[PDB]
Design a protein around this ligand. Structure first.
Ligand SMILES: [Co+2]
Length: 208
């Protein structure tokens, strides 16, 4: 019916969110799931920091909503419509380039459509599986080893390394395959703005 999670709040603020849910017969989870409907985010007056849940929130085209949505509904003895209340960036996108918009409204076409992503070698900040499940969420196709791209002329393939996580071999990925090596940052920024971005700024020196 309606399931909720929330990001970058203090307990003081959590309190309300609880008592907001409680009031309007809503369920609550600490852990973003496939079955969630809403992500609630701290802001500024509508700009959020960049949480893991931020991404999978958009990833989903769920309701990605700033906190004010709720303190304003407590105030006004009633729930407000969500459609007047979603977030509009962080740092990738300023107040400028609202993402969750497209996300929610798109879906019938995803932003990874017919691609193949391999999240290659060490991660940390945001660890492999979620990363994959992320792109997997917006219709990318997930490979485990470079040695599994079904090039089959048709589909386009990508490697994504997180660069720093490994302590200097990731120049020599081109030494195994004929997809490009974009950097994690490609995914993230692409999923924030929910366009599919330009590998240009994100490619990694591939060394014969
Ligand atoms: Co092409």
């Amino acid at each position: 019916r309606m399931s909720m999670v929330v990001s970058g709040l203090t307990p003081e603020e959590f309190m309300l969110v609880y008592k907001f849910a409680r009031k309007h017969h809503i369920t609550l989870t600490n852990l973003i799931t496939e079955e969630t409907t809403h992500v609630v985010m701290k802001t500024d007056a509508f700009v959020c920091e960049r949480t893991l849940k931020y991404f999978l929130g958009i990833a989903g085209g769920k309701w990605v909503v700033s906190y004010f949505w709720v303190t304003q509904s407590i105030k006004e003895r009633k729930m407000l419509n969500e459609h007047d209340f979603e977030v509009r960036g962080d740092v990738v996108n300023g107040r400028n380039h609202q993402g969750p918009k497209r996300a929610r409204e798109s879906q019938d076409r995803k932003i990874f459509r017919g691609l193949e992503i391999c999240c290659y070698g060490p991660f940390t900040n945001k660890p492999t599986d979620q990363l994959e499940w992320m792109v997997q969420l917006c219709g990318a196709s997930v490979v485990k080893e470079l040695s599994s791209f079904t090039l089959g002329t048709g589909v386009h393939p990508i490697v994504v390394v997180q660069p720093d996580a490994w302590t200097n071999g990731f120049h020599a990925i081109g030494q195994m395959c004929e997809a490009p090596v974009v950097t994690r940052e490609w995914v993230l920024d692409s999923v924030a703005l929910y366009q599919c971005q330009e590998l240009d700024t994100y490619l990694i020196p591939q060394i014969p």
